[PDB]
């Protein structure tokens, strides 16, 4: 298939493996999650514009909006973590081992 | 129903204007005689090609030419 | 061009159907120059 889809899928996998390998910050995790969403937006958009499927042109906007609301919720969770420990470090979130 | 209205117009005229304009926007298109013409103008706008019909022999309402009498007209739009 | 190639049907449809298929951009402008390609494939998008 087309050549641009290779790069958009590879971008989704790069943002996947960034989201699946945390370093320290939860904000960097949320950025990798939104990179995954952005690559999904681009890939859906290039397909729907290519196929001239008219009714799905409203589809990526929807894919934006919900997920950005999702991002808002994630930011709020991070802030609550930051209001407990002072930092958004993922190693502070280890109390549920016992 | 009248003292409360003068009270909220004395205290909060921004919000009274807000709810009043919103109420007009809700109820007024159902009371307008020209809401029908919005629909009629949006369906009178020819974005697509008028794909003609095969003349089977019995279609008295479909014209053979644009300048024929039968067919949909737009006298109402030119006159209003 | 495709004379030396073994097992090549010239003008072979890639579709099983015999219905007319709308010609793709690379089908039409594949053998032409890059200026004609760009003017036909990004001309309206890049027009100002």
């Amino acid at each position: 298939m087309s050549l641009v889809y290779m790069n958009i899928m590879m971008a989704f996998t790069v943002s996947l493996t960034g989201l699946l390998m945390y370093r320290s910050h939860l904000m960097s995790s949320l950025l990798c999650l939104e990179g995954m969403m952005l690559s999904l937006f681009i890939l859906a958009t290039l397909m729907i514009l290519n196929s001239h499927f008219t009714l799905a042109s409203m589809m990526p906007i929807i894919l934006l909006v919900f997920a950005a609301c999702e991002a808002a919720l994630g930011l709020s969770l991070l802030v609550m973590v930051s209001n407990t420990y002072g930092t958004d470090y993922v190693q502070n979130l280890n109390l549920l081992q016992c | 129903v009248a003292a409360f209205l003068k009270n909220v117009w004395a205290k909060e005229p921004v919000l009274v204007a807000s709810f009043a304009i919103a109420g007009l926007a809700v109820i007024l298109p159902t009371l307008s005689p020209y809401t029908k013409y919005s629909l009629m103008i949006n369906r009178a706008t020819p974005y697509n090609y008028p794909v003609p019909l095969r003349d089977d022999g019995n279609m008295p309402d479909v014209p053979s030419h644009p300048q024929d009498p039968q067919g949909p007209s737009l006298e109402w739009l030119k006159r209003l | 061009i495709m004379k030396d190639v073994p097992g090549w049907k010239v003008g072979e449809s890639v579709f099983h159907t015999t219905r007319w298929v709308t010609p793709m951009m690379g089908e039409l402008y594949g053998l032409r120059t890059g200026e004609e390609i760009l003017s036909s494939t990004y001309g309206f998008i890049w027009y100002t």
Partner: protein
């Protein structure tokens, strides 16, 4: 929380799951999962302590990752099929990504690592919602895509879930982690019979929801979150020890109880398809689940652990908690096996 806001948020959780159940477009499937997650996050942060925020953060990260993999599976389906019907998928890569995403949502092993944490971090009512209501929407999507699910993947996820949920509960004393590893084992049992007979998948889901709702309702009615506080129940309410006894013996699947009903039916559908090793090893692995159920029954019903003196004060007060549907759920989770051919209503 404002009770009106609690009602609207629980109706939004239910609305998300129902939108997953009734929709014919994959975008509305993804929207129902997003609405479900977005609305269930305040249910987990109901008490506002750092364990609830940690649990909600872990839950958000796992469900968000699964939602992104779900949308990538949907988008690859749109690549290779040009449409959006919620039916079989038209690419094994999209099928693998959707099966992984739904395994992450269900918390099936090896994507199980959030389930005993999050259930520990949240109250008993929100843990009840997470272990009963949050299974319904991904099992519906797995119900509708089973002509495309890889057999080796779904059975690998099933046996890995059953074994890890068996061994995980043996080391626990916290009741919520026990119910979470019980969840992982039972989801393994549900997905092991999915490609053979999905009516038995629905049967196992319904009997599991009934038994889990009974055990969480007993834990809420007795206000016990640990084994050793559940062992004070005989000196406070002796009927509740009988109820946790019969319900834990049901959840292990001992006949003549109704929790013997699903797994037996699952074996009844896996030997028709010439699989003998797999349901036998599954049934032998479920003895671990029954072992830590027996540990809880020895702590609670069949012995009497020592109590404290202040228990004598609680003798003067009856339970004012609304024990909603607890006799109904207790009867249904124990005495339903003579009505086993009722399962045809799920066909």
């Amino acid at each position: 929380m404002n009770p009106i806001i609690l009602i609207i948020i629980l109706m939004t959780v239910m609305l998300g799951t129902i939108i997953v159940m009734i929709s014919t477009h994959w975008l509305l499937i993804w929207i129902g999962f997003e609405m479900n997650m977005l609305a269930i996050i305040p249910i987990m942060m109901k008490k506002h302590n750092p364990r609830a925020t940690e649990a909600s953060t872990k839950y958000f990260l796992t469900q968000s990752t699964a939602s992104m993999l779900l949308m990538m599976a949907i988008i690859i389906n749109l690549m290779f099929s040009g449409q959006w019907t919620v039916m079989k998928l038209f690419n094994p890569m999209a099928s693998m990504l959707m099966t992984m995403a739904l395994a992450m949502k269900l918390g099936m092993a090896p994507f199980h690592f959030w389930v005993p944490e999050v259930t520990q971090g949240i109250p008993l009512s929100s843990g009840l919602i997470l272990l009963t209501w949050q299974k319904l929407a991904p099992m519906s999507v797995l119900y509708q895509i089973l002509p495309s699910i890889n057999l080796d993947l779904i059975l690998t996820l099933s046996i890995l879930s059953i074994t890890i949920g068996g061994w995980g509960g043996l080391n626990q004393t916290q009741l919520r982690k026990i119910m979470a590893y019980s969840s992982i084992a039972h989801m393994g049992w549900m997905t092991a019979v999915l490609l053979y007979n999905p009516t038995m998948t629905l049967l196992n889901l319904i009997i599991y929801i009934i038994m889990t709702s009974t055990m969480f309702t007993l834990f809420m009615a007795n206000s016990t979150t640990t084994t050793l506080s559940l062992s004070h129940t005989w000196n406070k309410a002796p009927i509740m020890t009988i109820l946790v006894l019969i319900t834990l013996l049901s959840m292990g699947g001992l006949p003549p109880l109704s929790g013997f009903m699903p797994k037996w039916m699952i074996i009844q559908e896996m030997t028709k398809n010439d699989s003998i090793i797999l349901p036998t090893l599954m049934a032998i692995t479920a003895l671990l689940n029954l072992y830590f159920y027996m540990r809880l029954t020895y702590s609670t019903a069949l012995t009497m652990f020592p109590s404290t003196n202040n228990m004598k004060m609680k003798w003067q007060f009856p339970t004012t908690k609304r024990m909603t549907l607890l006799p109904t759920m207790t009867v249904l989770s124990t005495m339903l096996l003579p009505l086993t051919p009722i399962l045809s209503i799920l066909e």
